Short mmCIF file of C-alpha atoms in Angstrom, two decimals:
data_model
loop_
_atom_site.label_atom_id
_atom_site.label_comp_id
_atom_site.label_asym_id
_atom_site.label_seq_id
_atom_site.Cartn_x
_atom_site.Cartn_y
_atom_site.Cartn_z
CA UNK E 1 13.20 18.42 27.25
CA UNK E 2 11.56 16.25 24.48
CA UNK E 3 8.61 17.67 22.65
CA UNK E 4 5.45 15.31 23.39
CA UNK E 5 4.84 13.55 20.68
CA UNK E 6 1.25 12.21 19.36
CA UNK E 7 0.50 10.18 16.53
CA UNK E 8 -2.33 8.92 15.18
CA UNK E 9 -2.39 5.40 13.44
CA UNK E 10 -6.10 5.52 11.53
CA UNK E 11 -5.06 1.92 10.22
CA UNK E 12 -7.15 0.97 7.53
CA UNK E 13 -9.67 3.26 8.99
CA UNK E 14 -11.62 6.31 7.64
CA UNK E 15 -13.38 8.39 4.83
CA UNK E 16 -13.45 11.99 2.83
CA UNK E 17 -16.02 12.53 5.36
CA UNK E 18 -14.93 11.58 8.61
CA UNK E 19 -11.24 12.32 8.38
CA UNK E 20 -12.87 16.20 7.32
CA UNK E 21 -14.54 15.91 10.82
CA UNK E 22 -11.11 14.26 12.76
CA UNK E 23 -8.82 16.98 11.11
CA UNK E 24 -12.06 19.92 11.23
CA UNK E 25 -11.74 19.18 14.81
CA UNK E 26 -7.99 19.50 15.84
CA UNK E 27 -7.68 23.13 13.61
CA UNK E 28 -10.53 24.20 16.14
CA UNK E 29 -9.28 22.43 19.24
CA UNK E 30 -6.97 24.00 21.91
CA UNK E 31 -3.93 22.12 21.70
CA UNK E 32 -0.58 23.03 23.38
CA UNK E 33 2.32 25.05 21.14
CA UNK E 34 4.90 22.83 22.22
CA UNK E 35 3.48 19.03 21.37
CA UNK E 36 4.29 17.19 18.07
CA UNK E 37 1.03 15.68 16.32
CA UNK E 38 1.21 13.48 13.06
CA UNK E 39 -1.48 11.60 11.50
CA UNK E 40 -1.74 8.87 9.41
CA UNK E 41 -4.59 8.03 7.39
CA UNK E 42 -4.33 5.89 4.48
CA UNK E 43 -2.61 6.57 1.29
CA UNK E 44 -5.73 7.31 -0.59
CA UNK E 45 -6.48 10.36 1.95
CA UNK E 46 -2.86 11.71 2.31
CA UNK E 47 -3.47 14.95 -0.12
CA UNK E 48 -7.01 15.40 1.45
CA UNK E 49 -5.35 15.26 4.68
CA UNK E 50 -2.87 17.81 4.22
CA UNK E 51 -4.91 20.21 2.42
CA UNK E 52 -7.27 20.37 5.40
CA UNK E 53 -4.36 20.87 8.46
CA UNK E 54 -4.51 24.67 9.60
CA UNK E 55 -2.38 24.13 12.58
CA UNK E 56 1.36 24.59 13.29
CA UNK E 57 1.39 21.51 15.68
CA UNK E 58 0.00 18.94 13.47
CA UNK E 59 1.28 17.15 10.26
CA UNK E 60 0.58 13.65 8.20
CA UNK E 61 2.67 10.77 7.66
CA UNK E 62 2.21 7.47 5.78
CA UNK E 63 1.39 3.92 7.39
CA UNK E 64 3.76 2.47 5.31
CA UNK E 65 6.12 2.63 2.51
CA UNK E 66 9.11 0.95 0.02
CA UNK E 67 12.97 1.31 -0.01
CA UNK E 68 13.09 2.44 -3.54
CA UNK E 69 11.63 5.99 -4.50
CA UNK E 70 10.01 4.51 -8.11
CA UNK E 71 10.02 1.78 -10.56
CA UNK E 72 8.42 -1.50 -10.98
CA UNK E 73 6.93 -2.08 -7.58
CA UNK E 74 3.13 -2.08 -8.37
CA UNK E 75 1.37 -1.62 -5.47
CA UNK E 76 3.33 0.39 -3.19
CA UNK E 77 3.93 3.75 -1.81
CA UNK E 78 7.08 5.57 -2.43
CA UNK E 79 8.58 8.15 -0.04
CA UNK E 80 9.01 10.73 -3.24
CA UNK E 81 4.81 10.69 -3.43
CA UNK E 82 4.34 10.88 0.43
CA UNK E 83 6.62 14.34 0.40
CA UNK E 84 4.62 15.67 -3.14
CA UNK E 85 1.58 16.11 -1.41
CA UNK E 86 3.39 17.39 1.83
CA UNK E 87 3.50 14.01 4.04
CA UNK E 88 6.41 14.86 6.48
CA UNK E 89 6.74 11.21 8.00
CA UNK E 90 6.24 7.29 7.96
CA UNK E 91 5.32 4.99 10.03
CA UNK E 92 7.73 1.69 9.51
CA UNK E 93 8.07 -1.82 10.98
CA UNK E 94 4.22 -1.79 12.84
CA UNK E 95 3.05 -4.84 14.31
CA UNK E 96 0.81 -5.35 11.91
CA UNK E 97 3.53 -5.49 8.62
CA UNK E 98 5.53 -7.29 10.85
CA UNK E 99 3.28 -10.11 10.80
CA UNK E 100 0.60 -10.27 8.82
CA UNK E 101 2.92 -9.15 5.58
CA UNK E 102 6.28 -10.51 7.58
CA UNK E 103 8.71 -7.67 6.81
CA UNK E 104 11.72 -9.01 8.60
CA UNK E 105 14.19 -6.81 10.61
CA UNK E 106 16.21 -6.11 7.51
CA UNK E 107 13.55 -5.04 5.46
CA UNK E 108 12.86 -2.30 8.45
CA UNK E 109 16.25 -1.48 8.52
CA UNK E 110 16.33 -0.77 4.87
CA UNK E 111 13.24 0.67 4.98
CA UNK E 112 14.32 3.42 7.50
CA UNK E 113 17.39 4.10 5.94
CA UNK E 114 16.14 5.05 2.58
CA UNK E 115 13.16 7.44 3.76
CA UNK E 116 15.83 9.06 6.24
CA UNK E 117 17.50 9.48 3.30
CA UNK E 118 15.09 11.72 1.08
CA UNK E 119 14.19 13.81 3.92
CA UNK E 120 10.75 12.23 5.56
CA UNK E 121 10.97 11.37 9.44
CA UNK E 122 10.42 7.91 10.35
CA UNK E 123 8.02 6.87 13.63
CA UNK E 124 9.66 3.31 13.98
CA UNK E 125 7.51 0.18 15.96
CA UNK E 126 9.42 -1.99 17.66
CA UNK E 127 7.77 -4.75 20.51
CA UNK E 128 7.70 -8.05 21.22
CA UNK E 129 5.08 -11.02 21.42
CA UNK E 130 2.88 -12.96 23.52
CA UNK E 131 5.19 -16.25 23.25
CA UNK E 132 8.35 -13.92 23.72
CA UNK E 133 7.48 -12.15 26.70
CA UNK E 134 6.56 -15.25 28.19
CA UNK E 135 10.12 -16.82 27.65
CA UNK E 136 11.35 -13.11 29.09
CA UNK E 137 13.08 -12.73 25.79
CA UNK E 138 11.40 -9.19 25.88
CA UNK E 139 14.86 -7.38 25.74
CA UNK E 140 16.39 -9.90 23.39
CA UNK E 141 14.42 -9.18 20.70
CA UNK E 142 13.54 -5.10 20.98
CA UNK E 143 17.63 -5.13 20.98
CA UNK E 144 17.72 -7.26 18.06
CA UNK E 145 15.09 -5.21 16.21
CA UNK E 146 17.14 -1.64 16.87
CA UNK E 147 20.38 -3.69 16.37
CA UNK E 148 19.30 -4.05 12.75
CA UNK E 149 18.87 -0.66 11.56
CA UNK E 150 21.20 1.02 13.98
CA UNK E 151 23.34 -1.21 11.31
CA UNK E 152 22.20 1.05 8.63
CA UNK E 153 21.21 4.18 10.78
CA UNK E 154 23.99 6.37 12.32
CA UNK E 155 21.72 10.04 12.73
CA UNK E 156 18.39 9.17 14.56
CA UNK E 157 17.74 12.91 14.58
CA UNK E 158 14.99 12.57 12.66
CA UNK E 159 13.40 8.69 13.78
CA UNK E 160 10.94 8.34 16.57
CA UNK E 161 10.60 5.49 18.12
CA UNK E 162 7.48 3.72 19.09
CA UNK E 163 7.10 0.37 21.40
CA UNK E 164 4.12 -1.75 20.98
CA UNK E 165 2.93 -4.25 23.64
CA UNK E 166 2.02 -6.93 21.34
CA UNK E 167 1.15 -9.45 24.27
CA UNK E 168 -1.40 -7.12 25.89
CA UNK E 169 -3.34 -6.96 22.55
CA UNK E 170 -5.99 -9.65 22.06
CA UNK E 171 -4.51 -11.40 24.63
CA UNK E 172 -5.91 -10.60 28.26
CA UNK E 173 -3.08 -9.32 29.52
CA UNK E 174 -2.63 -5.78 30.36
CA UNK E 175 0.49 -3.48 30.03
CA UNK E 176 0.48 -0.54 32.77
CA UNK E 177 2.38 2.72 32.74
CA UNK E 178 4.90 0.95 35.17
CA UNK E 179 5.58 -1.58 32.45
CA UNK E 180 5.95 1.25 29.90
CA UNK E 181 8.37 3.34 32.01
CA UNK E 182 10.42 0.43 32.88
CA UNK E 183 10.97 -0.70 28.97
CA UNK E 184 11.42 2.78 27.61
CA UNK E 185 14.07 3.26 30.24
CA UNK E 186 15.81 0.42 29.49
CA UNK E 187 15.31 1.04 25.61
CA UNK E 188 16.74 4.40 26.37
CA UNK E 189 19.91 2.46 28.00
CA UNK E 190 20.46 0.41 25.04
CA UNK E 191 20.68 3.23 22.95
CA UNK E 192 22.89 4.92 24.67
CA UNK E 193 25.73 2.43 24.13
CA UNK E 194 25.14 2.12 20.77
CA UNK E 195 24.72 5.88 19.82
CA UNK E 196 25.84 7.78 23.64
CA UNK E 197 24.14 9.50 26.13
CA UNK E 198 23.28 12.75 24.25
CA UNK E 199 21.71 11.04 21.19
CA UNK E 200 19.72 8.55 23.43
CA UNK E 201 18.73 11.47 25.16
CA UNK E 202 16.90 13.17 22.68
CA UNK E 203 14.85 10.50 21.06
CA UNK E 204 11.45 10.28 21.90
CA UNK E 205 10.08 6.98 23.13
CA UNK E 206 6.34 6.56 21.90
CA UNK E 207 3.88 4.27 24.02
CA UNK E 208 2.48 2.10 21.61
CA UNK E 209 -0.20 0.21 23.15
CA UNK E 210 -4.20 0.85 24.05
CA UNK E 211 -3.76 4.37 25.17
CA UNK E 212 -6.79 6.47 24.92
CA UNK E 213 -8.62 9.32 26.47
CA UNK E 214 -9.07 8.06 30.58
CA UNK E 215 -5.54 6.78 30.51
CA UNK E 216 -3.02 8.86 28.84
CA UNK E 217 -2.91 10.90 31.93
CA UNK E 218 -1.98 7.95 33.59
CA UNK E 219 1.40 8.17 32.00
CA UNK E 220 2.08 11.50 32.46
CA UNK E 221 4.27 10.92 35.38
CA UNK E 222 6.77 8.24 33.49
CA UNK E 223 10.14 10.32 32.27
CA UNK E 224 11.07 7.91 29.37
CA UNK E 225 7.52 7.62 27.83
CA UNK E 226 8.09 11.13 25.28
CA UNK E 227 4.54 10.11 23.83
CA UNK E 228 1.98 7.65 22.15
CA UNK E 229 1.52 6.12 18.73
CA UNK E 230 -2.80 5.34 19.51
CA UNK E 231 -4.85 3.10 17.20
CA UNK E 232 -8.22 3.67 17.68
CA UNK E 233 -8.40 6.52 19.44
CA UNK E 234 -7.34 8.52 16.90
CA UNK E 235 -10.41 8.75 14.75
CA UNK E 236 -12.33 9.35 18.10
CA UNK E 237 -12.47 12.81 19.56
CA UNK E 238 -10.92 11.85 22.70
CA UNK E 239 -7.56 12.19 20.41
CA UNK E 240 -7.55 15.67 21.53
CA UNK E 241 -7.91 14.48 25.22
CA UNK E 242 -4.29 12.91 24.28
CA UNK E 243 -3.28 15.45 22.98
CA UNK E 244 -3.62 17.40 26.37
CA UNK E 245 -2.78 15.02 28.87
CA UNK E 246 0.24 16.08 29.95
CA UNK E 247 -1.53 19.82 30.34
CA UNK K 1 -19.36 -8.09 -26.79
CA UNK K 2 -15.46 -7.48 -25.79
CA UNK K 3 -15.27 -4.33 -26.12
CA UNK K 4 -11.31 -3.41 -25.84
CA UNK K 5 -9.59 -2.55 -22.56
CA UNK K 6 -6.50 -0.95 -22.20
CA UNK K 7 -5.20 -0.16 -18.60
CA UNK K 8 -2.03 1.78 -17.80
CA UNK K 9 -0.64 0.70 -14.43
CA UNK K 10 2.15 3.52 -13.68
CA UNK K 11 3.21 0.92 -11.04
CA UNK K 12 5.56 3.14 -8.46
CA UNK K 13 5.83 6.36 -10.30
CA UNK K 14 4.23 9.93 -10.83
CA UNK K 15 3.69 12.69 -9.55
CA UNK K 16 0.92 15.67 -9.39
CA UNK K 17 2.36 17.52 -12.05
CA UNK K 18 2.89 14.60 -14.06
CA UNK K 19 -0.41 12.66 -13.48
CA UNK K 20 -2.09 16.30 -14.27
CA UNK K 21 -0.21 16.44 -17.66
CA UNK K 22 -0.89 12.87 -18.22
CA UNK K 23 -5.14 13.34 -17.69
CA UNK K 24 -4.96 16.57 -19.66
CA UNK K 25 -3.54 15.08 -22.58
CA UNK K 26 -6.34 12.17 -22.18
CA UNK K 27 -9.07 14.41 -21.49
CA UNK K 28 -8.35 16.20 -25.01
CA UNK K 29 -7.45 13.40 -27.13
CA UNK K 30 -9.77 11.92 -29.72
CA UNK K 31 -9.76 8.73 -28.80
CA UNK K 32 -12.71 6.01 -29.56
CA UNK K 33 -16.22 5.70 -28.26
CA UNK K 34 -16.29 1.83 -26.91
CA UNK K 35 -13.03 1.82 -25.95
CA UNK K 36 -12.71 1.30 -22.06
CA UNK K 37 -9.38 3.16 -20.34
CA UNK K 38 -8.44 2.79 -16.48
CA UNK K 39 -5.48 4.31 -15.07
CA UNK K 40 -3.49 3.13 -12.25
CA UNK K 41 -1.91 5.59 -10.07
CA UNK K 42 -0.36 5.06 -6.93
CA UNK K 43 -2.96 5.20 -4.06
CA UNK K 44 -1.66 8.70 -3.14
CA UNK K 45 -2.89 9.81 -6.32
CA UNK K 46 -6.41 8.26 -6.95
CA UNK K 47 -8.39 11.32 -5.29
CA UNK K 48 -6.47 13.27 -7.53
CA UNK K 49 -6.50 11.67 -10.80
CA UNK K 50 -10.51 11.23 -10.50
CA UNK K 51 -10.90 14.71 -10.07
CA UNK K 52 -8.93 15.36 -13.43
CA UNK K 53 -10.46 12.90 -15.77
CA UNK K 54 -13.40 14.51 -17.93
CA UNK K 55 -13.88 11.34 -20.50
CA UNK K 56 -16.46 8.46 -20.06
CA UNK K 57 -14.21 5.98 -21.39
CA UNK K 58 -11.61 6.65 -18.81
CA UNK K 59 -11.92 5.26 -15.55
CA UNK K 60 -9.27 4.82 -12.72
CA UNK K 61 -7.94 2.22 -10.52
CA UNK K 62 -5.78 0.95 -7.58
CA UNK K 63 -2.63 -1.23 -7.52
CA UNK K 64 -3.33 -3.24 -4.82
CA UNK K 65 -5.75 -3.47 -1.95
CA UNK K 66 -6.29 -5.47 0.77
CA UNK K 67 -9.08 -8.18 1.24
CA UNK K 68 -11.27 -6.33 4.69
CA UNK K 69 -12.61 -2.70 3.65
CA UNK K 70 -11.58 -1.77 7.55
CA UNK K 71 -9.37 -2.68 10.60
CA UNK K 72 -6.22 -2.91 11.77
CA UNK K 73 -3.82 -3.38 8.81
CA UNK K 74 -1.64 -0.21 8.48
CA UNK K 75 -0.33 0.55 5.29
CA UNK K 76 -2.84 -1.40 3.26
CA UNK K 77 -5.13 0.01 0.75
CA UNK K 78 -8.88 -0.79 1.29
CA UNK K 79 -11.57 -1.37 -2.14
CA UNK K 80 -13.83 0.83 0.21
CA UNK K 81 -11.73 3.82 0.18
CA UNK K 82 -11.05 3.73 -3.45
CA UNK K 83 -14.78 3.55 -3.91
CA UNK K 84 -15.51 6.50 -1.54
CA UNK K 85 -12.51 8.23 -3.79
CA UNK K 86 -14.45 7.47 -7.23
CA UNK K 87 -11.99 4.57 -8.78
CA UNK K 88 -13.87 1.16 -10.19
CA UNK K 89 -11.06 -0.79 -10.70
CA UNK K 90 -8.09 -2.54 -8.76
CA UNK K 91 -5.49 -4.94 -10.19
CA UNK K 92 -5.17 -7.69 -8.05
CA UNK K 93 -2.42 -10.83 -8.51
CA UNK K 94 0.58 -9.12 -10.34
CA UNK K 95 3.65 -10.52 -11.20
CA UNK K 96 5.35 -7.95 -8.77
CA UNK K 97 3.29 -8.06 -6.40
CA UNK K 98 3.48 -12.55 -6.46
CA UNK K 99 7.28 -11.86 -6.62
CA UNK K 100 8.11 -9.20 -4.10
CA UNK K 101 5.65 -9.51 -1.87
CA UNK K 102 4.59 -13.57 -2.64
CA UNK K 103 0.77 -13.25 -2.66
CA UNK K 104 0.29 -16.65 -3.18
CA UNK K 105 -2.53 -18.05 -4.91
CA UNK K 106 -5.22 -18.14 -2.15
CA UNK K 107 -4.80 -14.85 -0.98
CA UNK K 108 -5.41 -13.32 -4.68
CA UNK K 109 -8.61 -15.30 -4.98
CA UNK K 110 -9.41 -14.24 -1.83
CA UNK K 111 -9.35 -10.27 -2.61
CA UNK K 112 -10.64 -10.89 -6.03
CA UNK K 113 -14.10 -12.25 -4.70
CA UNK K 114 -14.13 -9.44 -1.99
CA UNK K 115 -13.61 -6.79 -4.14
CA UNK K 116 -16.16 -7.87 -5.96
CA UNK K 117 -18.37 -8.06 -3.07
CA UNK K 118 -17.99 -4.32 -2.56
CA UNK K 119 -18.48 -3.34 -6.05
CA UNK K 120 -15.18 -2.48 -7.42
CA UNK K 121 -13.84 -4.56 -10.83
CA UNK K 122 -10.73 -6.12 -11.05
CA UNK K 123 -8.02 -6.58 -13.11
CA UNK K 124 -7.17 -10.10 -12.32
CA UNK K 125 -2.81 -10.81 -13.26
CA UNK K 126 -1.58 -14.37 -14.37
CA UNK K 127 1.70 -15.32 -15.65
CA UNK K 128 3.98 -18.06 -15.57
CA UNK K 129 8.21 -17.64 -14.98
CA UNK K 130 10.66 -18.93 -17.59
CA UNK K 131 11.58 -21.43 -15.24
CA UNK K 132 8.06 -22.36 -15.05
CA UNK K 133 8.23 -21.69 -19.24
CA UNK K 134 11.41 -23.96 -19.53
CA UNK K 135 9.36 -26.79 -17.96
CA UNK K 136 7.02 -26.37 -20.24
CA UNK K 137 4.52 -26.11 -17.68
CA UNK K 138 2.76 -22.57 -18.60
CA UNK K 139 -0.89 -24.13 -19.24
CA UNK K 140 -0.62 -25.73 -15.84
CA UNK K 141 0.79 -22.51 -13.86
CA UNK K 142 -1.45 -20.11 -15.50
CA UNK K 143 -5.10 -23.29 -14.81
CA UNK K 144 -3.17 -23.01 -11.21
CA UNK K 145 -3.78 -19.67 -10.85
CA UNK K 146 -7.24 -19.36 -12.50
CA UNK K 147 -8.83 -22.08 -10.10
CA UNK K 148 -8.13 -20.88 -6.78
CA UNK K 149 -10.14 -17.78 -8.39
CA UNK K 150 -12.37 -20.38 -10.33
CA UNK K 151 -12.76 -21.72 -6.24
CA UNK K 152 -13.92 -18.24 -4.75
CA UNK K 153 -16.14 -16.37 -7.47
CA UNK K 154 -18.70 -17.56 -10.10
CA UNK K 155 -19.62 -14.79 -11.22
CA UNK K 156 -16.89 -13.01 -13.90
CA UNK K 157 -18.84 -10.42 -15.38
CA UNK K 158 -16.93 -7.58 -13.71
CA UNK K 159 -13.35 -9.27 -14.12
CA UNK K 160 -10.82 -8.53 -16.91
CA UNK K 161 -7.98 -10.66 -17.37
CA UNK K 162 -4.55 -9.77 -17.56
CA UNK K 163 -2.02 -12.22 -19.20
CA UNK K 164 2.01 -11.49 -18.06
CA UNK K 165 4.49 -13.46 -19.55
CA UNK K 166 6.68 -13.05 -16.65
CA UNK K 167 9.22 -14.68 -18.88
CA UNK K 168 10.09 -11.95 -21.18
CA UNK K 169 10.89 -9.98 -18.63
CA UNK K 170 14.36 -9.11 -18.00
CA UNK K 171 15.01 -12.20 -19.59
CA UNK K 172 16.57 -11.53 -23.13
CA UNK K 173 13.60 -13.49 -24.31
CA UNK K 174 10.80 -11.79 -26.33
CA UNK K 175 6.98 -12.61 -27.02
CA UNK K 176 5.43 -12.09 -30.07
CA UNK K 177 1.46 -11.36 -30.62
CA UNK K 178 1.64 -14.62 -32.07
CA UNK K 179 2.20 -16.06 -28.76
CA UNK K 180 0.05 -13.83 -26.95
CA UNK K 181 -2.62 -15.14 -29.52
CA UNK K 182 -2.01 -18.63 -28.36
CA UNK K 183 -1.91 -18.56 -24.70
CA UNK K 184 -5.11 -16.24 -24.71
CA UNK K 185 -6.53 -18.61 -27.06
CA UNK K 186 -5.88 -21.48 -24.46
CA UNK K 187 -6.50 -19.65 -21.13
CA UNK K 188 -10.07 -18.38 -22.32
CA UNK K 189 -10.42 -22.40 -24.00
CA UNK K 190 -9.77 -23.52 -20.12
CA UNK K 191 -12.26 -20.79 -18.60
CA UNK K 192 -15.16 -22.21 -21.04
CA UNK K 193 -15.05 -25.77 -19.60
CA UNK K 194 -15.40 -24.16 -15.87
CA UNK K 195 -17.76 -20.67 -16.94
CA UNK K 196 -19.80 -22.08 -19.87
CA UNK K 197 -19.07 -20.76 -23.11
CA UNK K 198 -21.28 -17.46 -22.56
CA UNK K 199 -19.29 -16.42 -20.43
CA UNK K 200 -15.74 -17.23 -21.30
CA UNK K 201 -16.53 -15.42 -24.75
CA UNK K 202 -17.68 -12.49 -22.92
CA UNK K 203 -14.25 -12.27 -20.93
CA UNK K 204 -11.81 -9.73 -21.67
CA UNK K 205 -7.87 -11.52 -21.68
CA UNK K 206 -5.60 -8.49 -21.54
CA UNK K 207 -2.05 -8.97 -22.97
CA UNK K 208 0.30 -7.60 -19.96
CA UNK K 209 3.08 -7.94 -21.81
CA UNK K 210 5.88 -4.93 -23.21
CA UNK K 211 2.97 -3.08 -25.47
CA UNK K 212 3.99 -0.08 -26.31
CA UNK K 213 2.82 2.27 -29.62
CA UNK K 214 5.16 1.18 -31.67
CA UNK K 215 4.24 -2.32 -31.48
CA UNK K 216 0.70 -2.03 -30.21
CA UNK K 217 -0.34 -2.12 -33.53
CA UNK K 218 0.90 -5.72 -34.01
CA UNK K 219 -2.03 -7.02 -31.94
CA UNK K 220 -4.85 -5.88 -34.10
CA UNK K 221 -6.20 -9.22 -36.15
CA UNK K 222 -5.16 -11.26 -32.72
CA UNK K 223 -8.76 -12.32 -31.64
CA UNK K 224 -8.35 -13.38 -28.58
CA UNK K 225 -6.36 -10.11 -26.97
CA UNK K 226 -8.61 -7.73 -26.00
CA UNK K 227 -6.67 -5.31 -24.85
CA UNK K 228 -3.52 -4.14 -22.36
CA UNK K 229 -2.12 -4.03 -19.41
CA UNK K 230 0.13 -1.26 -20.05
CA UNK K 231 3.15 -0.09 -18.09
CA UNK K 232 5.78 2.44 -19.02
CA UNK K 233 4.12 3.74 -21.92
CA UNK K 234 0.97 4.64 -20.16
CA UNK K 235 2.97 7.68 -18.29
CA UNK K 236 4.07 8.56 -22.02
CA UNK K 237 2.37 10.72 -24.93
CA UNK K 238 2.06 6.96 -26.64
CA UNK K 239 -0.49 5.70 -24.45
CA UNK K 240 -2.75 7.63 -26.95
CA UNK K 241 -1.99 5.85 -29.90
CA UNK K 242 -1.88 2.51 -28.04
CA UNK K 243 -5.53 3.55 -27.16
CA UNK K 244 -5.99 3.97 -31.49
CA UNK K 245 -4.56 0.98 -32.25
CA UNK K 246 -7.61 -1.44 -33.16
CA UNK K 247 -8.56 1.97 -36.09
#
């Protein structure tokens, strides 16, 4: 008893046009009453995006945004704007801010905090590297990235929490549903300790690597993956596929 | 030529209500025929605020975006989408965005010729720091910044300056339009021995500075600022008579 959860990471990725057709075709698709769907296009098609959902199941979410509400900060996306035009969650600490605009753990931490704080859920990526899980230090650092906001966060009722593979992207290696259960598990674990057993056992572990529509059944089996944060996939049709694989 | 500019970039603030009130007001006011007007909302608001505006001389922009139109770069903003979305301008290389977020050099020049590629103009930010002003070194911060651009693009003819005095911010310090006057004076003297003088004359050098509507007026008579890079006024009933100033 934790609600599937599916979201869709568009990146920077899509157009009026083809996020019509991606969001035309869940609203007509047959998707379980009983799974969580968010989607998150980029800023510049949030209000498009909302006005277009027609089903219960499915809401939008940001890719990104600051720890302040408003002010001086030209260039960003504020948590106030995201809720306006009817945004219900944000996606913080990805991969790809992680390194190619190096947010650092704290920034993450404060980050979370704040949006927690004015009411928008959080879907927050956690994962190590190539070079890390190589040294094993796979543990080490998914515990040091939770440490930091678990610093800041006491509730979690409201924060999902995705893992992303980041040596089985570009890389050659491959991550299998076996790796996923066993890290999610032991995710869960650490939680637990920091937050008990009934907390931990609530939160919803997203898969966060190449998941698409000939695997996700493939996980359907693994009690501690609770859903998928997909890439890709998402703009596809085979998002609804996902969407079902559990039944 | 150089025809006056004046941008308003709300930096992190707005919202529907407000940007509609905002566009409305601008949509009636009697405001000049070569005047040229971009506003900046926050990407969630672009869509939006293009829908609204009814006046050839206003135009709007983006904050930031990144320098690929697609890929795998969640939360970014892409010149592509803001295209798609009807905006023709994006300021790239402000102070707060250099500060915050340390776009260095390279990577500015780097968006600036890409937007470029795709069509969009931009609204190019300079500005030296106090401490950078102290050492007396503002001609060689501000040439610093202008090369790497100088490096990347040849061709300025869709490019507007904007000049920050980074310096008078916060500071205690204040600029006068005699200053402004100066550096202008100098940065579009240093643009001439790199563009030819065609085209340096032809450039518009925006005055980023605190303008406001009380002291817009102070700039008239200062022939080498073209314009402004407005910020808090441009949310404000003001940004009108900012817009009437040169009368």
């Amino acid at each position: 008893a934790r609600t599937f959860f599916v979201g869709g990471n568009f990146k920077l990725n899509g157009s009026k046009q083809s996020i019509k057709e991606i969001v035309e075709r869940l609203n007509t698709a047959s998707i379980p009453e009983n799974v969580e769907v968010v989607i998150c296009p980029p800023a510049t098609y949030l209000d498009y995006s909302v006005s277009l959902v027609k089903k219960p199941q499915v809401t939008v979410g940001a890719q990104n945004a600051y720890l302040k509400a408003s002010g001086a900060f030209t260039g960003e996306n504020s948590v106030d704007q995201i809720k306006d035009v009817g945004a219900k969650w944000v996606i913080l600490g990805h991969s790809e801010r992680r390194s190619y605009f190096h947010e650092d753990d704290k920034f993450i931490a404060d980050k979370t905090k704040f949006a927690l704080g004015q009411g928008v859920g959080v879907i927050l990526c956690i994962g190590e590297t190539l070079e890390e899980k190589k040294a094993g230090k796979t543990l080490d650092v998914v515990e040091r990235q939770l440490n930091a906001v678990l610093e800041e966060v006491k509730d979690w009722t409201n924060v999902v929490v995705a893992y992303e593979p980041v040596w089985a992207i570009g890389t050659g290696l491959a991550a299998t549903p076996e790796d996923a259960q066993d890290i999610h598990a032991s995710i869960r674990k650490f939680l637990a300790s920091k937050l008990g057993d009934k907390a931990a056992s609530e939160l919803r572990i997203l898969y966060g690597g190449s998941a698409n529509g000939s695997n996700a059944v493939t996980f359907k089996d693994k009690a501690d993956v609770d859903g998928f944060l997909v890439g890709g996939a998402s703009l596809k049709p085979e998002f609804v596929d996902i969407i079902n694989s559990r039944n």
